[PDB]
């Protein structure tokens, strides 16, 4: 599962950034340090659902024009290998497993059990929110649903819960081969007005923090290391310069591959020496 860090940044940034700019209360917390003049002018421009101006994000070397009033620019950056493992082995699995998901569900009333239903086959369960199923509950999984017994849990026919689970594909057990990669990626905000750039960079730092709690970040992209450059004129051949402070993001992740095993031993016969 080769990880495209650049795609992950875009997937996380685009929704979360829109949400942050949507409300004003969060922005005030973010821009608490800045002076009144810069803070409100930025808020007057981009903040709120009724903002006429809008921010954009894209990758480098596009053949079209970007909104140079305010824009996030990304470029892939360097990559390095840091740590290996014996035989390049990472893990062994009895089931072909995909991504790890979080889903919300409501308990359903069966005869002997209360069951939750999920959009896909459960495979490996990880956690149901704030439930410590005892052995007498007899927690078990079946297809796309998870079940626990009804008795002495009868108040919970309407229980509303979140579920963390994995996507199951096949029963073909296999090994993992791969290593760890230390990758760096560059991000920069652009504007023809320096004050906007500083506000824009500060907004970015917050959502990077929020990404530390994300499922993908916690499981796949770990050990953030942020580095900020000096504010510089990106462009000078024009009616006015473009100013932007580049930032560098570092990640640790695994470049993994699945190796499938077919040599399943089932029979075992003992024969003594003829002598």
């Amino acid at each position: 599962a080769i990880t495209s860090v650049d795609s992950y940044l875009l997937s996380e940034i685009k929704p979360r950034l829109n949400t942050v700019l949507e409300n004003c209360y969060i922005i005030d917390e973010v821009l608490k340090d800045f002076d009144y003049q810069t803070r409100e002018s930025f808020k007057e421009a981009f903040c709120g659902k009724n903002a006429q101006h809008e921010v954009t994000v894209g990758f480098n070397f596009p053949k079209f024009k970007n909104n140079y009033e305010a824009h996030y620019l990304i470029q892939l950056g360097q990559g390095q290998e840091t740590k290996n493992s014996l035989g390049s082995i990472q893990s062994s699995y009895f089931e072909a497993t995909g991504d790890t998901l979080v889903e919300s569900s409501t308990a359903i009333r069966e005869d002997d059990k209360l069951v939750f239903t999920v959009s896909k086959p459960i495979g490996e369960l990880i956690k149901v929110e704030d439930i410590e199923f005892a052995k007498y509950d007899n927690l078990q999984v079946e297809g796309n649903k998870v079940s626990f017994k009804y008795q002495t849990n009868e108040d919970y026919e309407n229980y509303n819960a979140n579920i963390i689970f994995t996507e199951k594909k096949n029963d073909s057990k296999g090994l993992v081969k791969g290593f760890t990669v230390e990758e760096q990626v560059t991000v920069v905000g652009l504007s023809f007005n320096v004050d906007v750039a500083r506000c824009l960079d500060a907004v970015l730092k917050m959502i990077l923090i929020s990404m530390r709690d994300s499922i993908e970040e916690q499981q796949t992209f770990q050990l953030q290391n942020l580095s900020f450059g000096d504010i510089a004129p990106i462009i000078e051949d024009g009616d006015s310069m473009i100013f932007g402070r580049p930032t560098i993001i570092k990640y640790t992740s695994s470049l993994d591959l699945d190796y499938t095993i077919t040599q399943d031993i089932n029979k075992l016969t003992f024969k003594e020496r003829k002598d």
């Binding site: 023809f192 024009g238 009616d239 006015s240």
Partner: peptide, 25 residues
């Protein structure tokens, strides 16, 4: 130099009521 990085709309010019291409006698 041309204006491409920042663009402002055309200026609001005060108009005159005189009809153009007016015939007189």
């Amino acid at each position: 130099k041309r204006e491409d990085v920042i663009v402002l709309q055309d200026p609001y010019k005060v108009n005159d009521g005189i009809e153009e291409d007016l015939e007189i006698q």
